[PDB]
Amino acid sequence: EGDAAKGEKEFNKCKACHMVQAPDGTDIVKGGKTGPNLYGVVGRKIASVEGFKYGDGILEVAEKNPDMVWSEADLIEYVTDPKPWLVEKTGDSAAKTKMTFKLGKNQADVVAFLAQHSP
Numbered sequence: 001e002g003d004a005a006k007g008e009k010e011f012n013k014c015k016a017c018h019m020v021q022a023p024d025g026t027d028i029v030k031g032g033k034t035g036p037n038l039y040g041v042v043g044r045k046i047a048s049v050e051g052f053k054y055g056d057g058i059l060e061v062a063e064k065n066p067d068m069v070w071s072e073a074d075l076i077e078y079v080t081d082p083k084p085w086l087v088e089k090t091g092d093s094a095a096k097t098k099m100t101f102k103l104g105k106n107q108a109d110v111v112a113f114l115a116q117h118s119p
């Protein structure tokens with residue numbers, strides 16, 4: 001539904017904290033390590049990157065929904081603002097988020113870009 005080409009450019013806003021790197025080490029987008037690798041994130045189980053120290057809130061969503069993977073819809077909501085997304089799922093207004101960056105536009109496009117590299 002989104003446009004991956006605009007998504008790729010907008011992802012510049014994410015790359016301070018996230019890379020897109022394939023399992024063989026191929027860099028699609030070089031980025032930081034503060035947040036998890038986002039290669040393959042679309043259709044991935046929520047908070048499931050081994051070795052990453054996730055916050056308590058996103059782990060609670062995964063524990064409550066053990067089979068739940070990132071849908072495009074959920075990704076669009078989460079990247080808009082992680083906090084209300086966690087609050088809705090956990091029912092805890094104090095739910096912890098390690099990510100507070102907000103993307104108020106072009107969300108579907110960034111998600112389309114990520115989907116192109118979630119083969």
Ligand code: HEC
Binds near residue numbers: 013053075097098
């Ligand atoms: C650092 C300041 C960040 C920026 C800028 C962006 N994100 Fe992020 N992200 C960050 C952290 C520390 C975490 C872990 C969250 C937690 O509470 O543990 C995340 C997480 C995500 C996820 C979920 C990944 C998973 O494996 O489940 C996604 C899908 C995600 N981030 C996407 C994303 C995008 C698209 C960004 C730019 C618009 C972006 N993040 C910015 C840290 C940081």
